[PDB]
């Protein structure tokens, strides 16, 4: 099918676009309401809150109650005392529940790098300027290339290669 | 699968289905569950919900702001009109004072417009960030759906919550229509007329405590104000049953019936149409009027 | 509070608007000088160091713009540009294959040697056989690249799921 | 730094020029109250404003007290289709009987005398003023158009201009074919003359 | 037009500017030797034409508030280049005054300026020279996004039934309304608060603070947009077509003595 | 039995603005399509639904105008337009654009339609991860809005 | 603090795959260089030799660029910056497949 | 103009009207292409036939091409 | 309003113009095709086996 090859509906023009069976999934839905195409074979776990992180620079912007409502887990082994809650498709609210166990993904290197880009450096409108010495090297390279070009033009035209003087 | 040209959210095509297919048992169950329903003509709903006084459909806080600004402007008028000097006769001085008053009012009109714009901007912010002003479960239903795309119950709940998030002086609720409430409640009209007469008498006393020429000018103004205030609250206040009984012209009775129908369509229609039927011998009309006074009124 | 503009990536001023052209100019004048005097005006390793250093700006700006300026419109633009670049590379390969096969599809050819039959035991396979082309090692390299393709496709799909 | 602006109040710039105040443009240095409040001086206008303001306050208070402390005897819920934000307006803007026709005719006569001819003359002045603004070598006024232009509808134009033109083109085509063939070869159906 | 600047320093026969123009473009010996052909009348105000247009005017010139308006600095340009300027301006101002003296509560005034012209190409709606950054906050918004979509064709494109597109369940519920009122003992539910599109009426008009509550006066400036390539105007409820044709005839009949003595060559 | 945690999308800024309110942003960036030639033919011969159009006031009347909403800066003129042919005598070949002051009643005297182009500013919380996760009140918002009205705020470019 | 974590880096699938692909690409480059010098008899100054060598040299240049891309993606995957929907991953996959 | 060939032939009756019109357009595109190809192929085959006829009527009594061109065996 | 659909603005061709244009175009095509493909006489062959010469 040309339509399906070029990322279209396919044979049926009223058909959708996503085929999560072969890896064509919806990132927006996953980020907002979680991967509801894994809903049949995955279940939320229900029962260490997040209040211990209420004093950190980036999490201090939240209220105490908000962090108290969040319950954490080690994220490796199943808590044997934790019940299982069925994951209901077509329900946009279950991914945001406070009764389900969660995992503190605030020590992830990507998390730290993002928040540092926002909370750990002086804001520069130009990412190249966010690195001072590299910008220095780059402008120096530009000047070097200008000089090299001028010298090469001078040498090739006049037939003397500047090494004997 | 190695590519992904998705968008933030696919467009939504409505599914129409149709009116429910309720069987006989379901039909009887529904009919036994309804209240005592009175089906209303579109004219009745129109007169109930017509725009009469609040011409611009301005909310409460906008009217309050306008009245407050008028008070503040009046409290400053004598200072601005004091000491004006211009070369000319009395008429030229009067025109100079009129221009000064106009400048004062144009100055005050801009502050009011600025404040209206600021409150409108606050409310625009409320709409622009709805998920940050809502609790669960309405938050996700405001996140995923637009106003036209919400269920009626969820739509109403979301709008009410967003309105109530604001302070009392920013909530956008339509102001009361004086003429409407007077037209659909006979006591309210009587109270309004009593208030008009009380203010007229008090103003007449205040005027009578003033020098002569001002007395005549202000008394004429008071008469005009009372007349126009009455015509504003109830344009048909002169169509009394005494006047109806005193009227023996078919065209005049038709005019009265039209004027009442425009205003409220109340039992005075029964009176006018009964007197028209008697003067013309319309037995069918008399039967219809009996039915109306039994049911309509 | 911030004021939100259109989805379109507004754009930033950058030094890459002239650094890359100056890099191309440097490379071409380097080639011209090497052609004229048969010697290098600047050491080749130093030249490659300059070239590499100039182009480190792309990943940095890419990182800091993904962190801050990205949405599905921008991602679609970028992916379509990637597709067009792949198309250009395919066309380049097609042109070079045209160059290669021009004199091979045209079977008749004036050869320094004999290729008729019944004169020697091997003449009849002189023109139709370049028997030194390292076929066994070419097949080994083919196996390596098939490994890479299949493994990469598997991993890509696995993470995507 | 130069003259940095203080605050962020509205300034007329390229992106925004504001909403003109035609009333002040027209009634410049002339009072408006002789038209809105004829016959009244400033003191009378202020006194009337105060009296009416107090009266309006009283009426508003009465109305709010009434609406906020009345017992509900009936509940009116209009019918609307599912998925519809607001019910359809039950008011019609078309006269139905002859009395409504006479009423709307009187209203139309008043509006014509007092609201439509003013609009027409204002718009005519605006068009002429735009012409004057673009005149004098600034823009392309007078290069085409005018009151003598012959404006034709689609049917009239196609029937009286397009088809005859194509007809003349076709006749020219045939005549030129024959004449050119004769001119070059010297014959009409025999190719070169004195050769074949 | 053009602002000559300092007339004094450009009148001299020999000038650095004239020599530079000769060298590079704009001047030459043809101007020094034959000014009557290559300079001639030049470009500037025509005093005689201004006097003629002034003295052809009626007493409207006395009764117009033009000389106190902010555009009074353009009096000579419009007197010269707009024949019959004062009579047309007087009609314009009297039209505004009669709209002001109406019996309607809302006085609508038509506004036309450089923005009142539509165009099919977006670069024609900007001021020249164009701003550095344009359409920063997105592009145009089409009014057609507020019209009902082609539901039938939309269903048909997808291969959906669409049989009952015009048959919808009725809805009579209190949960569907947020605007509740009490009108004479009757609790009326009607409408939902939508937001910024429910307050278009008040945000468009400005009140006269001195007008009483029983005789309100509101001022509204109605903007006008036209294509200028249409040749036919349809004002809607503001002006009927028959009245507009009447106004056209009368305007062309009155403003004829100001136009008949000139040729367009 | 095992526990899985899907890797979240950490990007902030424009992406997090898009993912916080996907309905509004999609509305801003959702393409809609116009009718082809056969579709125009099939639409022009569809029937009206009821006799309401003979009595009611059309959409685009002096009392029922076409209100439209753009995003931008307060007071900036709004860009709006027709697709052409709102009237029989109006052109329909291509879309026709318009520049109009905000929050004012404008009338197109080509078609005769009254419209209310108006601006809503997209003031949103600084997206750096400090956005609030639970219902917020009017105090902090009051301060931010006061500062924006008095002085202005940066643009998300 | 931001500290490199070899445990997490080695427990990540993208880092392993890209490193393995970069290693195989380097092996391929070395092998192909070993047949250009000490295997063949014809040089780039012949009829078939020139076209063949131009083709394989262009392919080798593209392989070098792909090796650089795979190394960059290995660096980003070690840091944990490459997500499932990464256009960098998409570009490298498409380029390697090409 | 281009009337829809599928309507008077009853093809693609299960498709919505838009897609049926698309098929009609494809069919018309197919028809318009086959015209010039048909004209030129007809002319070429007529030219080959005429060449065979000429070689038959000229090399009928020849001794060199009396059996190849004369009979038309390898014209 | 779609004003360019098939139901609007149909202008019938006057009979005289129709006849003239049809005759003109038919005559043009016939004459050109005739003189281009049928009046080619420079492709002349003379069959004469008695004009050969051999020493
Ligand atoms: C403008 C160009 C428009 C046409 C091409 C659109 C894209 C084609 C698909 C594609 O790119 O898949 C990405 C593919 C992975 O795609 P995917 O989304 O993972 O899954 C495949 C789809 O599901 C789709 O899978 P599928 O089931 O539809 O199968 C693909 C289909 C369509 O394939 C083709 O049309 C291939 C055409 C090339 C010639 C061989 C077939 C004839 O192939 C066939 O029907 C024939 C298979 C081969 C037969 C060989 C013997 C004959 O990755 C690569 O191919 C990487 C290398 C880069 C490819 C090109 C990228 C686009 C740049 C322009 C390409 C123009 C040249 C034509 C393409 C092939 C190279 C010569
Ligand atoms: C036959 C050729 C058709 C046109 C080219 C293919 C094309 O546009 O693909 C778009 C499509 C994506 O376009 P798209 O974004 O419109 O499709 C996705 C549609 N939605 C949003 C509904 C999911 O690209 C591909 O499928 C892969 C790239 C193909 C283009 C390669 C470069 C071509 C350069 C020359 C032109
Ligand atoms: C994914 C990208 C892959 C890229 C690599 C290549 C993929 C394979 C397809 C490439 C097609 C385009 C390039 C070749 C076209 C040019 C060929 C050429 O030189 O033509 C001139 C030659 C003619 O040359 P000549 O006769 O004028 O003279 C030759 C030179 N002298 C004068 C010295 C004798 O061939 C033709 O003109 C033939 C007709 C053109 C079409 C050829 C099609 C080739 C199909 C190959 C099929 C097998 C492919 C896989 C193995
Ligand atoms: C600027 C780019 C970087 C610098 C130039 C790189 C390209 C140089 C080409 C000439 C190389 C000659 C040479 O020494 O070859 C040695 C080598 C080997 O030469 P050889 O095979 O003769 O060596 C002798 C080998 N034996 C022992 C068997 C006898 O040549 C190649 O490998 C061919 C490489 C050619 C270049 C292919 C890439 C494409 C070039 C650019 C195309 C751009 C098109 C679009 C614009
Ligand atoms: C060679 C000719 C190149 C032409 C242009 C190619 C365009 C490819 C664009 C790919 C793209 O945008 O990817 C987006 C992706 C990013 O996708 P993204 O936008 O999703 O970003 C996600 C970012 N993280 C992972 C941090 C969350 O970026 C890249 O692929 C990296 C940039 C391109 C490669 C830069 C290489 C730098 C190293 C040095 C190069 C110079 C070497 C000199 C020679 C040395 C010889 C020994
Ligand atoms: C024939 C001989 C020449 C042959 C080679 C040239 C080939 C043709 C021309 C190619 C294009 C060249 C364009 C001109 C480039 C000149 C350098 C330049 O523009 O540098 C800008 C750069 C800006 O640096 P930035 O980090 O932006 O800092 C801003 C303020 N802090 O600032 C710097 O780098 C420092 C200041 C440089 C100022 C200009 C040079 C003097
Ligand atoms: C992808 C690309 C593939 C590669 C390309 C392949 C080829 C492309 C297309 C090939 C076809 C081209 C046109 C073929 C027609 C012309 C050849 C022909 O029909 O020849 C017949 C005739 C020979 O007759 P002759 O030998 O002159 O006379 C013998 C006794 N009188 O011929 C003559 O008389 C020749 C003299 C006239 C020459 C001028 C043009 C004549 C064309 C038509 C001739 C026949 C007339 C029939 C048509 C009616 C016209 C009114
Ligand atoms: C600037 C344009 C130059 C290119 C030439 C194009 C000329 C097109 C003229 C077509 C006239 C036309 O409308 O054809 C329709 C009529 C049939 O009439 P009806 O069915 O519309 O009522 O059909 C007829 O009337 C038959 C006449 C068609 C003959 C073709 C035109 C001959 C003119 C050639 C000029 C070079
Ligand atoms: Zn329009």
XYZ file of C-alpha atoms and ligand atoms in Angstrom, chain C residues 27-28 31 92 96, chain G residues 36-37 40-45 53-54 57-58 61, ligand 4:
64
model
C 39.288 22.749 2.583
C 39.142 23.779 -1.067
C 43.387 21.161 -1.933
C 24.745 10.537 -4.965
C 28.451 7.096 -8.861
C 42.512 -1.974 -0.693
C 46.230 -2.036 0.081
C 44.222 -6.018 -5.331
C 46.425 -5.486 -8.370
C 44.558 -2.681 -10.161
C 44.725 0.917 -8.951
C 42.456 3.944 -9.396
C 44.250 4.773 -12.676
C 37.341 2.392 -6.213
C 35.220 5.539 -6.406
C 35.532 4.915 -1.343
C 32.212 6.733 -1.208
C 33.283 7.578 3.695
C 37.034 17.377 0.442
C 36.820 15.972 0.978
C 38.004 15.408 1.749
C 39.305 15.374 0.965
C 39.198 14.724 -0.405
C 38.673 13.298 -0.387
C 38.451 12.703 -1.766
C 39.722 12.503 -2.568
C 39.491 11.855 -3.924
C 40.751 11.376 -4.625
C 41.475 10.256 -3.898
C 42.669 9.719 -4.667
C 43.445 8.714 -3.872
O 44.531 8.907 -3.402
O 42.770 7.572 -3.736
C 43.387 6.537 -2.936
C 42.408 5.407 -2.769
C 42.957 4.107 -3.286
O 43.627 4.349 -4.539
P 44.231 3.127 -5.363
O 43.246 2.023 -5.346
O 44.691 3.662 -6.662
O 45.532 2.659 -4.570
C 46.393 1.632 -5.113
C 45.805 0.361 -4.553
N 46.451 -0.935 -4.994
C 47.436 -1.387 -3.963
C 45.389 -1.976 -5.139
C 47.154 -0.782 -6.307
O 41.238 5.783 -3.559
C 40.025 5.479 -3.076
O 39.840 4.738 -2.150
C 38.951 6.209 -3.825
C 38.336 7.351 -3.028
C 37.672 8.382 -3.922
C 36.755 9.360 -3.206
C 35.382 8.791 -2.915
C 34.474 9.691 -2.095
C 33.747 10.770 -2.875
C 34.580 11.991 -3.224
C 33.795 13.292 -3.166
C 32.555 13.324 -4.047
C 31.692 14.559 -3.850
C 30.481 14.626 -4.764
C 29.460 15.680 -4.370
C 30.030 17.082 -4.238
